[PDB]
Amino acid sequence: MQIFVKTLTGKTITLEVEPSDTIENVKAKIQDKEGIPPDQQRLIFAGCQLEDGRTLSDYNIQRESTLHLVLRLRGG
Amino acid sequence: MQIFVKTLTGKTITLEVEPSDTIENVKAKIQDKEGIPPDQQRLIFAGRQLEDGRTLSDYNIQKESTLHLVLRLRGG
Amino acid sequence: MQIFVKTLTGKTITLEVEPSDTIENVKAKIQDKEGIPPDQQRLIFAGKQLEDGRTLSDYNIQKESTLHLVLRLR
Amino acid sequence: MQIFVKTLTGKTITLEVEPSDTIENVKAKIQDKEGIPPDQQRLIFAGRQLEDGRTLSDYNIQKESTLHLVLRLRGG
Amino acid sequence: MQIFVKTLTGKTITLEVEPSDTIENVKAKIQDKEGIPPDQQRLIFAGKQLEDGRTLSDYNIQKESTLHLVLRLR
Amino acid sequence: MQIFVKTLTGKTITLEVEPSDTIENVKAKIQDKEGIPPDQQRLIFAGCQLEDGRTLSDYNIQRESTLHLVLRLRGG
Amino acid sequence: MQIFVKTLTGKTITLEVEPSDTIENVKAKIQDKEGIPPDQQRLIFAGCQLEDGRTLSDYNIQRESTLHLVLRLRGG
Amino acid sequence: MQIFVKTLTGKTITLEVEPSDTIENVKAKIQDKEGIPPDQQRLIFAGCQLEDGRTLSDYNIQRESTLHLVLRLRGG
Amino acid sequence: MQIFVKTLTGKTITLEVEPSDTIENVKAKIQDKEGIPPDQQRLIFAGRQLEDGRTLSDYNIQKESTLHLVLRLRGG
Amino acid sequence: MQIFVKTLTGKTITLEVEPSDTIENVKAKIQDKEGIPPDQQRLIFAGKQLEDGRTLSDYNIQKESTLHLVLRLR
Amino acid sequence: MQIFVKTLTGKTITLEVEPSDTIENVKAKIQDKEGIPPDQQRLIFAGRQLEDGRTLSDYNIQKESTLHLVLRLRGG
Amino acid sequence: MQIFVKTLTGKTITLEVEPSDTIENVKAKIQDKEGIPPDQQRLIFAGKQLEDGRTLSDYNIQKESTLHLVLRLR
Ligand SMILES: [Mg+2]
Ligand SMILES: [Mg+2]
Ligand SMILES: [Mg+2]
Ligand SMILES: [Mg+2]
Ligand SMILES: [Mg+2]
Ligand SMILES: [Mg+2]
């Protein structure tokens, strides 16, 4: 299934994901597409920050749901 | 601005709303688009049930935020 | 048999339940495991809120089905 | 990557860890370095006690984050 | 006598307690002042987690000693 | 005593601070060294954002602790 | 006089500047308002990247001209 | 010989490379070490972006030279 | 999308244009808004004079880019 | 007297000129200093392109006035 | 901040410099460290020879950038 | 004989030159092949800038030697 990530730049990127994929995987898929390191990504769906731990279905992210990307920059 | 209301069943409606619109209004806009009576709608954002009283901005629902729709159905 | 109750926030509890258990019982078993009063629980399956009245099998909740937990008010 | 674990007593251990390492692993790495049994360790990040279950990235522990060590010992 | 409980979040609460009060009592007094359920509280003094069983004087917590509050969530 | 602040660039500033100094003071000492206005600084220790109100010892920042400097950048 | 900077986030910030102010100054004024380190800022006007060296009038930036902010992230 | 690549986070990876290795190879060696897809990597030495085509010696990258890893993020 | 055309005299017109519009069209849209004959207009972007032939996207003129207007005035 | 010729790109040349010098002369003095052929130069003052014909004082270009240099085609 | 100046001969100097230092200053700092007269130094960054006039930040020389040293000597 | 000119930008041009050709000639041959005006070229061999005056053999530039091209802009 397909989901959408809208970034801080306003850009709307599409990802092929599986409900059993983790937030970590999605972060990783985003790096693979836009270059941002996963440690610097924060994903938001329905008014929560998502945990790298959990999966898309853990949060009820279904076919064509839209996620938000925020950036955290730290000297890591 | 646009928001998304997704049911747990995976159906997703898009709504044209104003930050100053109330939960009541959104419920009403949902009925106007999918037929569900507002008394049978429960809206959820950021893990909590929204009150018909308050407004979208009261809850920090912004451009392209996603809400969750849960339904009350008698004998359903 | 086992079922799963997931919150929208992504937390997931497992419960040991019987098909003949009621929604009331499941609510009660959830309180027994996570502390939430049953009056504050809303259970959701197949897109709709379940009635305390009915049973799991009344709704077709089988071995390893997933329910949703939403919270009322305080 | 490196992280720091500081006790409330002011002692500080440095650990070589991976974001995918679990709290269990970190506990285990601490024993390997200072002798404390993992069942006697409580790790704290961002104000709260971490679960042995979850991983460092589950909590957003990144390169050079600082964790807190508290000790649990019966009658100690 | 007065003691201080400092959370890892930087907040500092003051409590009116008696040397003969138990850790359980202090937990209970903290709930009464900040809302946190005692099952979610961990008190720390002199580097170690205190037992609900024991009392303040059992640990040598005197007038104006500082305890640490950590949170444990299920 | 000395503490370290890491910026978003990965650069490390060293600060001479006193445990009784406030977050406000440290922010102010950082501006004095790297130019960033205190209102724009987000200091993070052990996974939480520090409040200008509190002091270093309020947070358990000791000799040679490392603080992080964070920027959060959010969508349109 | 007033100028506008539109950022990568889509945000449009207003700056009080003098024609004799340098690009460095503007960068510095932006940090003072949004937190971004000047070394990470790239300013664009009329299809050129601006040099920290030159001034607003060097480029013909007048009252109410609009500049663009791009971000360059590097391990500096 | 050894070279150093610094990321946007400020983190430093070390690479065992040969002067006759191409930028493509180095990009590939970086993916193998930090996960970033080569198409998303922008390597900078001495102020210019390196082309996948050319080799390290084509650019005068010698024993212990430092390369930079850049991300450019642009407005809507 | 919107673009800005600024004269050297500091006057700034805003235009509603399409990336596929030609320089000729923009000139024509400028006449329609400020009266200047297209033969008396010289458009400049990124330091070079634009050709009536080419289009906005041919030159990479995007949403909110700024063009420069220079004028030809006989005996003026 | 001195005048300044600035490109839109922010580069700025200084020229020693006389009020009675023509636009042609200034173009010619610019070539002599930066290499650009006069046929490729467009000089701009007070928002308009100057004519090779006229002089600096014809346009009111005085000590330390600033002109603009734009480039034609190649 | 630190920068590196490498000669084509493979010799490498490190310099402590400030972004506001001029090319003249850097030349002067090089003489102070290796003896070469500034009139005999040519500094190169991003493929081009730097002007004594401009500053490091004018060119976007940041923390740990690498410059190139060429030598100009009559009949040498 | 052939020589190589490598720019700092990583590009590598090949030139057909004669040992008796001057630095001026090589500059001129580079313009003829890549467009750069000779006044903007700096040639570097063995660590130092070459003089337009001298010849390739004056510097010991032989078959397949490599020169370096840097750019100087006014
Ligand atoms: Mg994980
Ligand atoms: Mg992670
Ligand atoms: Mg430390
Ligand atoms: Mg400067
Ligand atoms: Mg080096
Ligand atoms: Mg700068």
Automatic annotation (TrEMBL), chains A, F, G, H:
One of its GO terms (cellular component) is cytoplasm. The keyword Ubl conjugation applies. Pfam families: ubiquitin (PF00240). It comes from Musca domestica. It is found in: Cytoplasm; Nucleus. GO terms for biological process: programmed cell death involved in cell development. Residues 1-76 form the Ubiquitin-like domain. Keywords: Cytoplasm, Isopeptide bond, Metal-binding, Nucleus, Ubl conjugation. This is Ubiquitin. Mg(2+) binds at residues 24, 39, 52. Its main location: cytoplasm.
